[PDB]
Amino acid sequence: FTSPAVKRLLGWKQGDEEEKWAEKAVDALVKKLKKKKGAMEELEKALSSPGQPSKCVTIPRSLDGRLQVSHRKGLPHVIYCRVWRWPDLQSHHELKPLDICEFPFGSKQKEVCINPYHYKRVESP
Amino acid sequence: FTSPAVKRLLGWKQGDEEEKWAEKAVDALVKKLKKKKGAMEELEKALSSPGQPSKCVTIPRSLDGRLQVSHRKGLPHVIYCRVWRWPDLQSHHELKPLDICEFPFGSKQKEVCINPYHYKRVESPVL
DNA sequence: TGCAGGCGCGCCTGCA
DNA sequence: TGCAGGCGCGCCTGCA
DNA sequence: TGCAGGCGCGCCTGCA
DNA sequence: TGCAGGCGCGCCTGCA
Ligand SMILES: [Zn+2]
Ligand SMILES: [Zn+2]
């Protein structure tokens, strides 16, 4: 537990280039999900109640499989798993989908599920 | 132009190892400044009003010159200039004190000024 | 309708 | 094949 | 000589 | 007092 003065000084802290890019990625995601009824609400539910099961929160898959946000490319499930669960996540080799996920990245479907609680972290083989 | 829902989703964002280390460094700083009358108030004033002049906000200098925060060592003025002004700051070679600073790191005194607005960013010289 | 500017997927290339 | 990075057309948006 | 990194004793604090 | 845990400066070492 920190002091109110500590919280105030941390409000003046400058975010690094990576933190600023993550904000852009969350913003790019919301723009897509706002077009789908209940998607925003489902993602918020998954981030708020980790122990509770949640539905798939998907986005369209590109031919390459990579997603671009502000001049940077990456795998969509890796990008959002890094934002909300594991900032030190190395690659998709460190992820495996849970059995409930109907649209995991590896399934190569039209839609890709980006619900970070539909993936588990594994040791890279 | 941030939407309320974006503000909420960003509240659930995990800070990286570097962001978490910075919180420890700010906490380690406050513990030292709380012992000095008006030091906390002066630092808050310098971060809130960047165009306004402010006094020195100093901490004791070690023999080495380096400060340790949670198993990691660095120069104190570099640490706090990175927190509040330039996250991409490479070394002390990229900093020069202002003329108003009475306690710059380079002057080698018993106290070192860590007010980030008492330093200016310069290009590091070619070796 | 003329004139701009911002974004990203698709396309291409280059190591290993 | 896996993995990455550079480039630009097409699409979208906003004025007067 | 500049620049790092690893180790532990001394110091401080918090329950009972 | 007894007992424990967290933190960092000082000390040491190793390059180029
Ligand atoms: Zn899913
Ligand atoms: Zn100063």
mmCIF file of all heavy atoms in Angstrom, chain B residues 99-124, unseen atoms left out:
data_model
loop_
_atom_site.group_PDB
_atom_site.id
_atom_site.type_symbol
_atom_site.label_atom_id
_atom_site.label_comp_id
_atom_site.label_asym_id
_atom_site.label_seq_id
_atom_site.Cartn_x
_atom_site.Cartn_y
_atom_site.Cartn_z
ATOM 1 N N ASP B 99 22.098 26.249 -15.182
ATOM 2 C CA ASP B 99 22.938 27.139 -14.381
ATOM 3 C C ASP B 99 22.418 27.339 -12.946
ATOM 4 O O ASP B 99 23.235 27.491 -12.035
ATOM 5 C CB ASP B 99 23.174 28.476 -15.093
ATOM 6 C CG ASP B 99 24.024 28.358 -16.351
ATOM 7 O OD1 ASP B 99 24.832 27.388 -16.441
ATOM 8 O OD2 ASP B 99 23.883 29.231 -17.250
ATOM 9 N N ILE B 100 21.074 27.314 -12.747
ATOM 10 C CA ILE B 100 20.431 27.474 -11.434
ATOM 11 C C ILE B 100 20.742 26.350 -10.465
ATOM 12 O O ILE B 100 20.682 26.584 -9.264
ATOM 13 C CB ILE B 100 18.889 27.728 -11.476
ATOM 14 C CG1 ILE B 100 18.171 26.976 -12.614
ATOM 15 C CG2 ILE B 100 18.607 29.256 -11.536
ATOM 16 C CD1 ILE B 100 17.887 25.628 -12.366
ATOM 17 N N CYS B 101 21.025 25.127 -10.957
ATOM 18 C CA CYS B 101 21.296 24.022 -10.052
ATOM 19 C C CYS B 101 22.571 24.208 -9.242
ATOM 20 O O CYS B 101 23.683 24.315 -9.779
ATOM 21 C CB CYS B 101 21.278 22.683 -10.763
ATOM 22 S SG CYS B 101 21.212 21.271 -9.639
ATOM 23 N N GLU B 102 22.372 24.238 -7.927
ATOM 24 C CA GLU B 102 23.404 24.408 -6.919
ATOM 25 C C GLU B 102 24.071 23.074 -6.575
ATOM 26 O O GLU B 102 25.206 23.076 -6.089
ATOM 27 C CB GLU B 102 22.751 25.018 -5.669
ATOM 28 C CG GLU B 102 23.656 25.780 -4.710
ATOM 29 C CD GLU B 102 22.928 26.156 -3.427
ATOM 30 O OE1 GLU B 102 21.688 26.359 -3.476
ATOM 31 O OE2 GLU B 102 23.597 26.234 -2.370
ATOM 32 N N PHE B 103 23.374 21.935 -6.836
ATOM 33 C CA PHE B 103 23.872 20.582 -6.517
ATOM 34 C C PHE B 103 23.847 19.594 -7.684
ATOM 35 O O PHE B 103 23.333 18.490 -7.508
ATOM 36 C CB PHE B 103 23.122 19.990 -5.307
ATOM 37 C CG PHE B 103 23.261 20.832 -4.064
ATOM 38 C CD1 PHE B 103 22.255 21.712 -3.687
ATOM 39 C CD2 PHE B 103 24.437 20.810 -3.316
ATOM 40 C CE1 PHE B 103 22.404 22.524 -2.563
ATOM 41 C CE2 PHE B 103 24.583 21.623 -2.192
ATOM 42 C CZ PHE B 103 23.570 22.477 -1.826
ATOM 43 N N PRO B 104 24.411 19.920 -8.868
ATOM 44 C CA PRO B 104 24.391 18.943 -9.972
ATOM 45 C C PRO B 104 25.233 17.695 -9.680
ATOM 46 O O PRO B 104 26.168 17.759 -8.884
ATOM 47 C CB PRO B 104 24.974 19.738 -11.144
ATOM 48 C CG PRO B 104 25.865 20.752 -10.501
ATOM 49 C CD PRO B 104 25.103 21.164 -9.272
ATOM 50 N N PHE B 105 24.897 16.569 -10.305
ATOM 51 C CA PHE B 105 25.626 15.321 -10.102
ATOM 52 C C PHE B 105 27.156 15.467 -10.329
ATOM 53 O O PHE B 105 27.949 14.957 -9.534
ATOM 54 C CB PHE B 105 25.019 14.179 -10.943
ATOM 55 C CG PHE B 105 25.846 12.916 -10.920
ATOM 56 C CD1 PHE B 105 25.750 12.017 -9.861
ATOM 57 C CD2 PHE B 105 26.738 12.632 -11.953
ATOM 58 C CE1 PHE B 105 26.540 10.860 -9.830
ATOM 59 C CE2 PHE B 105 27.527 11.479 -11.920
ATOM 60 C CZ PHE B 105 27.423 10.603 -10.862
ATOM 61 N N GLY B 106 27.537 16.161 -11.388
ATOM 62 C CA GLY B 106 28.940 16.343 -11.741
ATOM 63 C C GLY B 106 29.802 17.141 -10.778
ATOM 64 O O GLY B 106 31.026 16.984 -10.791
ATOM 65 N N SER B 107 29.185 18.004 -9.942
ATOM 66 C CA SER B 107 29.900 18.862 -8.984
ATOM 67 C C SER B 107 30.513 18.087 -7.799
ATOM 68 O O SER B 107 31.316 18.649 -7.049
ATOM 69 C CB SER B 107 29.005 20.000 -8.505
ATOM 70 O OG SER B 107 27.918 19.524 -7.726
ATOM 71 N N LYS B 108 30.142 16.796 -7.651
ATOM 72 C CA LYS B 108 30.620 15.844 -6.636
ATOM 73 C C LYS B 108 30.566 16.391 -5.170
ATOM 74 O O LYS B 108 31.588 16.434 -4.475
ATOM 75 C CB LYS B 108 32.027 15.313 -7.002
ATOM 76 N N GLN B 109 29.355 16.773 -4.708
ATOM 77 C CA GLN B 109 29.090 17.291 -3.355
ATOM 78 C C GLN B 109 28.438 16.200 -2.496
ATOM 79 O O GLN B 109 28.079 15.148 -3.036
ATOM 80 C CB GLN B 109 28.192 18.530 -3.437
ATOM 81 C CG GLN B 109 28.919 19.717 -4.040
ATOM 82 C CD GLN B 109 28.034 20.922 -4.202
ATOM 83 O OE1 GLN B 109 27.716 21.623 -3.235
ATOM 84 N NE2 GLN B 109 27.638 21.202 -5.438
ATOM 85 N N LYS B 110 28.284 16.428 -1.168
ATOM 86 C CA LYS B 110 27.669 15.428 -0.274
ATOM 87 C C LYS B 110 26.186 15.122 -0.652
ATOM 88 O O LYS B 110 25.676 14.029 -0.350
ATOM 89 C CB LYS B 110 27.835 15.808 1.217
ATOM 90 C CG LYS B 110 26.976 16.983 1.683
ATOM 91 C CD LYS B 110 26.875 17.077 3.206
ATOM 92 C CE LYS B 110 26.044 18.260 3.660
ATOM 93 N NZ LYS B 110 24.581 18.038 3.476
ATOM 94 N N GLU B 111 25.520 16.087 -1.337
ATOM 95 C CA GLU B 111 24.135 15.977 -1.808
ATOM 96 C C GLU B 111 24.091 16.028 -3.331
ATOM 97 O O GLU B 111 24.894 16.731 -3.945
ATOM 98 C CB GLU B 111 23.269 17.124 -1.239
ATOM 99 C CG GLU B 111 23.048 17.108 0.268
ATOM 100 C CD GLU B 111 22.318 15.922 0.875
ATOM 101 O OE1 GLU B 111 21.066 15.934 0.921
ATOM 102 O OE2 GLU B 111 23.010 15.000 1.364
ATOM 103 N N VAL B 112 23.162 15.293 -3.948
ATOM 104 C CA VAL B 112 22.989 15.327 -5.405
ATOM 105 C C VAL B 112 21.545 15.755 -5.711
ATOM 106 O O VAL B 112 20.609 15.188 -5.154
ATOM 107 C CB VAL B 112 23.473 14.048 -6.175
ATOM 108 C CG1 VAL B 112 23.013 12.767 -5.500
ATOM 109 C CG2 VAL B 112 23.034 14.054 -7.640
ATOM 110 N N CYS B 113 21.370 16.772 -6.557
ATOM 111 C CA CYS B 113 20.037 17.245 -6.932
ATOM 112 C C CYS B 113 19.398 16.308 -7.954
ATOM 113 O O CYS B 113 20.027 15.963 -8.969
ATOM 114 C CB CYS B 113 20.075 18.691 -7.417
ATOM 115 S SG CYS B 113 18.497 19.300 -8.063
ATOM 116 N N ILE B 114 18.170 15.859 -7.652
ATOM 117 C CA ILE B 114 17.431 14.925 -8.511
ATOM 118 C C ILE B 114 16.185 15.585 -9.133
ATOM 119 O O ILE B 114 15.373 14.860 -9.707
ATOM 120 C CB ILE B 114 17.117 13.556 -7.827
ATOM 121 C CG1 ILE B 114 16.411 13.687 -6.434
ATOM 122 C CG2 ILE B 114 18.380 12.729 -7.712
ATOM 123 C CD1 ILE B 114 14.915 14.179 -6.400
ATOM 124 N N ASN B 115 16.063 16.949 -9.063
ATOM 125 C CA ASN B 115 14.973 17.710 -9.686
ATOM 126 C C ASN B 115 15.143 17.574 -11.214
ATOM 127 O O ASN B 115 16.141 18.065 -11.755
ATOM 128 C CB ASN B 115 15.013 19.192 -9.244
ATOM 129 C CG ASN B 115 13.923 20.084 -9.804
ATOM 130 O OD1 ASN B 115 13.314 19.821 -10.854
ATOM 131 N ND2 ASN B 115 13.659 21.173 -9.108
ATOM 132 N N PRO B 116 14.243 16.841 -11.923
ATOM 133 C CA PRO B 116 14.473 16.615 -13.363
ATOM 134 C C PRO B 116 14.474 17.874 -14.226
ATOM 135 O O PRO B 116 15.007 17.850 -15.346
ATOM 136 C CB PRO B 116 13.381 15.612 -13.761
ATOM 137 C CG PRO B 116 12.389 15.637 -12.686
ATOM 138 C CD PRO B 116 13.037 16.129 -11.445
ATOM 139 N N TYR B 117 13.936 18.984 -13.692
ATOM 140 C CA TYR B 117 13.882 20.275 -14.398
ATOM 141 C C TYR B 117 15.112 21.158 -14.124
ATOM 142 O O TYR B 117 15.180 22.285 -14.600
ATOM 143 C CB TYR B 117 12.553 20.986 -14.128
ATOM 144 C CG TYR B 117 11.422 20.249 -14.812
ATOM 145 C CD1 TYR B 117 10.646 19.328 -14.119
ATOM 146 C CD2 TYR B 117 11.195 20.392 -16.180
ATOM 147 C CE1 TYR B 117 9.632 18.609 -14.753
ATOM 148 C CE2 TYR B 117 10.185 19.685 -16.822
ATOM 149 C CZ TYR B 117 9.403 18.794 -16.105
ATOM 150 O OH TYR B 117 8.418 18.081 -16.744
ATOM 151 N N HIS B 118 16.120 20.599 -13.443
ATOM 152 C CA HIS B 118 17.417 21.231 -13.197
ATOM 153 C C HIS B 118 18.479 20.646 -14.157
ATOM 154 O O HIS B 118 19.665 20.980 -14.052
ATOM 155 C CB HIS B 118 17.829 21.076 -11.723
ATOM 156 C CG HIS B 118 17.272 22.138 -10.824
ATOM 157 N ND1 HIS B 118 17.864 22.438 -9.619
ATOM 158 C CD2 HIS B 118 16.196 22.944 -10.995
ATOM 159 C CE1 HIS B 118 17.152 23.430 -9.110
ATOM 160 N NE2 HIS B 118 16.142 23.769 -9.906
ATOM 161 N N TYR B 119 18.033 19.810 -15.116
ATOM 162 C CA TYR B 119 18.870 19.182 -16.158
ATOM 163 C C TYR B 119 18.236 19.385 -17.543
ATOM 164 O O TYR B 119 17.017 19.536 -17.683
ATOM 165 C CB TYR B 119 19.096 17.660 -15.893
ATOM 166 C CG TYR B 119 19.798 17.350 -14.586
ATOM 167 C CD1 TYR B 119 19.071 17.140 -13.410
ATOM 168 C CD2 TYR B 119 21.191 17.325 -14.506
ATOM 169 C CE1 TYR B 119 19.714 16.902 -12.189
ATOM 170 C CE2 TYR B 119 21.845 17.105 -13.289
ATOM 171 C CZ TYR B 119 21.102 16.889 -12.133
ATOM 172 O OH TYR B 119 21.746 16.637 -10.945
ATOM 173 N N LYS B 120 19.069 19.398 -18.562
ATOM 174 C CA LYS B 120 18.614 19.536 -19.943
ATOM 175 C C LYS B 120 19.159 18.363 -20.719
ATOM 176 O O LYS B 120 20.231 17.845 -20.364
ATOM 177 C CB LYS B 120 19.035 20.886 -20.562
ATOM 178 C CG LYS B 120 20.526 21.205 -20.519
ATOM 179 C CD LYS B 120 20.826 22.590 -21.062
ATOM 180 C CE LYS B 120 22.285 22.964 -20.891
ATOM 181 N NZ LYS B 120 22.442 24.335 -20.324
ATOM 182 N N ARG B 121 18.411 17.902 -21.740
ATOM 183 C CA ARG B 121 18.877 16.780 -22.540
ATOM 184 C C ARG B 121 19.765 17.274 -23.666
ATOM 185 O O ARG B 121 19.399 18.225 -24.357
ATOM 186 C CB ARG B 121 17.719 15.910 -23.054
ATOM 187 C CG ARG B 121 18.216 14.667 -23.759
ATOM 188 C CD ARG B 121 17.111 13.756 -24.210
ATOM 189 N NE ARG B 121 17.659 12.462 -24.609
ATOM 190 C CZ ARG B 121 16.932 11.392 -24.904
ATOM 191 N NH1 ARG B 121 15.603 11.457 -24.890
ATOM 192 N NH2 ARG B 121 17.526 10.251 -25.218
ATOM 193 N N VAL B 122 20.948 16.647 -23.816
ATOM 194 C CA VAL B 122 21.941 16.933 -24.870
ATOM 195 C C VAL B 122 22.231 15.651 -25.667
ATOM 196 O O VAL B 122 21.976 14.546 -25.189
ATOM 197 C CB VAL B 122 23.264 17.588 -24.346
ATOM 198 C CG1 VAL B 122 22.989 18.895 -23.615
ATOM 199 C CG2 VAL B 122 24.081 16.640 -23.465
ATOM 200 N N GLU B 123 22.790 15.807 -26.870
ATOM 201 C CA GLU B 123 23.231 14.694 -27.719
ATOM 202 C C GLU B 123 24.545 14.179 -27.084
ATOM 203 O O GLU B 123 25.390 14.998 -26.681
ATOM 204 C CB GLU B 123 23.505 15.179 -29.149
ATOM 205 C CG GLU B 123 22.398 14.920 -30.161
ATOM 206 C CD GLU B 123 22.792 15.217 -31.601
ATOM 207 O OE1 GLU B 123 22.981 16.408 -31.940
ATOM 208 O OE2 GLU B 123 22.899 14.256 -32.396
ATOM 209 N N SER B 124 24.688 12.837 -26.927
ATOM 210 C CA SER B 124 25.894 12.217 -26.358
ATOM 211 C C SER B 124 27.111 12.409 -27.324
ATOM 212 O O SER B 124 26.997 12.060 -28.501
ATOM 213 C CB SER B 124 25.657 10.733 -26.084
#
